[PDB]
Design a protein around this nucleic acid. Structure first.
Ligand SMILES: [Zn+2]
Length: 433
RNA sequence: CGCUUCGCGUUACAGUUAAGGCUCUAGAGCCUUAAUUGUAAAACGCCUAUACAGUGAAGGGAUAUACGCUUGGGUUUGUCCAGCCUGAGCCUCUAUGCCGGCGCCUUCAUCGUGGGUUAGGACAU
């Protein structure tokens, strides 16, 4: 009995099916929803880790400055100590601190810039502080090595690590800005020009400030706009992330032959395997046809596909059907493909595990306050949500808040809630229920 | 998946200022709410003492070194991991921070007591 389990893996939903290949009977067919909340949770972890390690570095800098200043005779009371210890909590940026994310971060930088200073300002301020406090010059020079000190090393050059795709080498892929010579040529191999012209284009695009010859060639030669964009991405050194798999396999990857993967992808695959282990109990599948996508003559094995095959063998022929046959037998057996349809995923899993014939008669079936016994935490006017405006303890600003959220239904500056030193939004105490 | 500060915000304490009042007899005190200044905390825990930071000097720095490879250790638990930190030869793969000046290797004095991780993915319960 050829019980073949077919798994169609989308970016969000996943279809599972088990098709007895005699008479193309279907013994199991199901859909499953994958966890899409893991990347945001990891982003929350990254933000929390950055906050905690910034606080820890602040503690280390404060302890070091306190120890040094008490060593050179500047006790806590010293008017020369309090000024320097006050500027230690606010040392400022040392000029060392897709479009939506850029726009978003750009605003917070300006937000930080509108209410902070440059390292040089806090430093010239500790200068004037210790130049009238009789600190000679060496001691002021030694507190500049505490203000302008990095405690945890900033190591970001070789962190995002990707292995190769061809599966017989899992070596470290280089960054896109290191193997540009192997990158640009990967474009020009599929070009209808002479090899000498290929080398001339290599020399022109590969920096050397010779983009005018690149533009002249591109005006002269008929070349696609996406290839135009890729070449100009190579030439302008705007490349980000690692290269598309290792150097010896950039130019040759037409032959076939995984502990590292995205943890969101890993937990999606494990959820699918959790459902698979609920298929495994009552069905012994002798073969597995899997096509893992987003939504022969195929491309290389996907990292999620490879991890899925390895974990399926751990929990056996596990093949990957081409998209041509699956797409053909799909619409030809009725209906078409819909992105985000769970039924479509289930029926693609049914088709994937089915024994194909040829010429339609086979496929059957933040801390809080605890004063006076009542909880009252402070929330900014931006952080106060509608419906819960009555929890504000401040009766002086309660009417003002509700009126602004009704009369006016930037708005805070219009409503006059930017009353601070740097015109920041004020915060009100709200009674937590 | 990740490094890193700049902040913002929260809580706790100690002050100051501005309103809106309760009590004593124009004044005094404290009640709330805003703003402002200063300090501290932001996991608990686990693991470091053979570890970690500072100080000054000789040493290497594209035939150093490691964020790179192999194998461990901490986090690490009921169990396995991810990430981060790190030991040890490793240099095959990964690559270079800054304008000799950063990191690194020992070394006295190290009096020091400091350091890493920290609620995320699965199974069982
Ligand atoms: Zn390769």
């Amino acid at each position: 009995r050829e019980l073949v389990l077919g798994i169609d893996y989308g970016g969000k939903y996943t279809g599972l099916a088990v098709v007895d290949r005699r008479h193309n009977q279907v013994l199991y067919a199901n859909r499953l929803k994958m966890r899409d909340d893991v990347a945001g949770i990891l982003k929350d972890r990254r933000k929390q880790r950055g906050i905690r390690r910034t606080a820890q570095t602040k503690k280390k800098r404060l302890r070091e400055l306190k120890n040094y200043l008490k060593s050179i005779g500047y006790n806590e009371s010293t008017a020369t100590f309090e000024t320097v210890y006050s500027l230690a909590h606010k040392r400022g940026y040392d000029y060392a601190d897709e479009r939506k994310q850029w726009e978003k971060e750009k605003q917070e930088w300006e937000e930080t810039k509108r209410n902070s200073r440059h390292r040089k300002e806090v430093v010239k301020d500790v200068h004037k502080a210790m130049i009238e406090g009789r600190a000679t010059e060496e001691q002021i020079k030694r507190v500049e090595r505490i203000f302008n000190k990095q405690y945890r090393p900033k190591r970001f050059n070789n962190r995002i690590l990707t292995k190769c795709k061809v599966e017989d080498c899992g070596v470290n892929t280089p960054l896109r800005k290191n193997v540009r010579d192997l990158l640009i040529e990967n474009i020009v191999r599929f070009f209808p020009i002479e090899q000498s012209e290929k080398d001339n284009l290599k020399d022109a695009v590969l920096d050397k400030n010779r983009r005018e010859e690149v533009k002249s060639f591109f005006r002269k030669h008929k070349t696609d706009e996406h290839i135009r964009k890729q070449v100009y991405d190579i030439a302008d050194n705007k490349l980000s992330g690692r290269t598309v798999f290792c150097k010896e396999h950039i130019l040759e990857h037409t032959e076939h032959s995984v502990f590292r993967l995205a943890p969101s992808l890993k937990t999606k695959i494990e959820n699918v395997l959790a459902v698979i282990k609920d298929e495994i109990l009552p069905k012994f599948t002798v073969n597995k046809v899997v096509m893992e996508s987003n939504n022969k003559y195929m491309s290389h094995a996907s990292i999620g596909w490879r991890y899925m095959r390895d974990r399926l063998r751990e929990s056996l022929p596990i093949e990957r059907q081409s998209g041509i046959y699956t797409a053909y037998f799909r619409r030809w057996w009725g209906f078409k493909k819909e992105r985000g349809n769970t039924l479509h995923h289930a029926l693609d899993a049914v088709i994937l595990a089915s024994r194909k014939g040829y010429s339609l008669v086979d496929m059957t079936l933040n801390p809080l306050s605890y004063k006076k016994g009542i909880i009252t935490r402070r929330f900014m006017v931006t952080e106060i949500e509608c419906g819960k405006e009555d929890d504000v303890i401040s009766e002086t600003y309660r009417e003002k808040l509700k009126e602004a959220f009704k009369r006016f239904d930037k708005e805070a500056k219009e409503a006059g809630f930017c009353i601070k030193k740097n015109e920041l939004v004020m915060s009100l105490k709200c009674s937590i229920k």
